[model samples]
Target: MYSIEVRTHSALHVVKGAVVKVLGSEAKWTYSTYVKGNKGVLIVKFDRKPSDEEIREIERLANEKVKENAPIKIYELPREEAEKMFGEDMYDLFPVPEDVRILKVVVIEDWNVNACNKEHTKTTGEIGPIKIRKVRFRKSKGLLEIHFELLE
Candidate 1:
């Protein structure tokens, strides 16, 4: 497994070229919120300035990747219990420790802000390297793709 880090200009430039080659000219980028303050998309700030066509496609693929990788249901504990233990802004305590980690955490919807770092994930593991099945850039959803694991 590989640890993820913010891709630098030198790094992202290469990434763009590679993605374009592998996923085709329709390929787009999904910049991590870590770089963009969570309010805007990552591709918008690229140094190379991809064409409108590429930006649109990247956005579509990003959302689709989110759908594929995001937790099907964001796990929430009860508000009362959560407040007692964690506080608000659950993004911090991401990948909430498994039950075994604490035997019990009074599991609830409340979150602990002090524990969050803004980077949110259901768990601390690699999710993809997903196969690119298809990519589409359009008005409603800019860049999108559909991918799945192979059946054994």
Candidate 2:
């Protein structure tokens, strides 16, 4: 993957962890897109729309993880083990193929985990500053889409 793509995708996970930290851990992720322009999108279903303060907290928490320079580790786990650990994760719900035996899991230290196969930076420090540019809520779908960017 391109350097920008890696950075952007990595940022998406950082934001996800931050969102989970600030909001309830029960929040469910719906979708995500990593752009090549140092930007990323994250769609999540939450208890309710977040307040401006909550959004700011999410941004701050993400930057804190970046500043902490957590290591990003990737491992291939057996499907059974992956399910035992992350069965409730959204990836298992709709992303991972049913027939895949080995699942590739990425962890940002102890911050976040995902069954992902995308290229990512070795350290969260490489992500730089994270900014939440816009947050839109889909009423009918009851999902929130967060638009964020890296200000490196």
Candidate 3:
């Protein structure tokens, strides 16, 4: 449970949080998480592409959270409450099942929140340092493929 997988997957949340911090609260985005070897691949779909400076800001913001050492707390909430609180732009790949009455909510301090079933680190410091390998943008799909790895 304590391995690169958890750290990598946990970094996905940090990346998303960093996006929100850089883009703005009303910005909309969704992401899919994958692990390639020891790297974390987060494919985020957005309306438009971000500039190099913006990407740098996101990376810096993410590392700031990493240093913040925020706690990642797991708890339960009513289906609709958690679902709605997660916002409409939550991960499309893993939406909270409607049939379930209770939701497993994962909140990374005040940085990120999602109704997730996956495992994550107890604190952000355990996530180590996340380095963005590259960001590829596809105009047709309007998605940003953010490839990053952790240095533990």
Candidate 4:
């Protein structure tokens, strides 16, 4: 019933060492923010779920937290192949059912932003192989909740 609200103009800045790069984009709701020496959270809803392009743009922005050195995740599964390996019932176990679910992940050092260290090349690979733990959604509200467990 609700869609993404795009504020006329908004800006985000990521602080990497002494340099800050502007993140140029606006959404109906921002799940988070940074200002007044602290971070804030904003929830922006969209008229429709983001398209593939928007998702990729969001991923690129978040990767800035990893300084472009971390491996990202894609929810896409070779389903035809996955079913061949597991079976059709496997689809029922995930929130997206027969669809892929993607998420962005990264590593942090010491939890200290000012002293954060960047170790990009040390690990350059997709950190994935995730599993769905719960599959459920609220159809009346058009909200889907997926509980996933990281595979070790």
Best by lDDT: 2
- For 5-44, candidate 2 gives per-residue lDDT tens digits of 7888889888898988888665656465547678788888
All candidates: CA RMSD (Å):
15.1, 2.0, 2.2, 18.2
Q: How many backbone clashes does candidate 4 have?
A: 11
lDDT of 4 by residue, 1-152 (tens): 11111110011112111011122222212222222211212222223344445444443443444344432222233545544543432221222332443311122232111111111222212222222233233445443332232222
lDDT of model number 2: 0.81
Q: Candidate 3's error at 148, in angstroms?
A: 0.5
> Between candidates 1 and 2, which one is better according to TM-score?
2
Question: lDDT by residue for model 1 over 1-152, one digit each (tens)?
Answer: 22233212112222233344435534333423222211121231123334556545644453344334433113344445555655442222134454523212211111112222222334212233322233333334453322222111
The clash number for model 1 is 10
Prediction 1 global C-alpha lDDT: 0.31
Candidate 4 matches the true fold with a TM-score of 0.23
Q: Residue by residue across 58-131, what tens digits does model 3's lDDT show?
A: 89999999899889888788777765776654445455556888777778866877777788899888888889
In model 4, which runs have C-alpha deviations exceeding 4 angstroms? Answer: 1-26, 30-44, 68-152
Q: How good is model 2 by TM-score? A: 0.90
**lDDT over C-alpha atoms for residue 40 of model 1:** 20
TM-score of 1: 0.25
Question: Each candidate's TM vs. the true structure?
Answer: 0.25, 0.90, 0.86, 0.23
Could you arrange the candidates by TM-score from highest to lowest?
Answer: 2, 3, 1, 4
Q: What lDDT does model 3 reach?
A: 0.78
Query: How accurate locally is residue 42 in candidate 2, as Cα lDDT from 0 to 100?
Result: 88
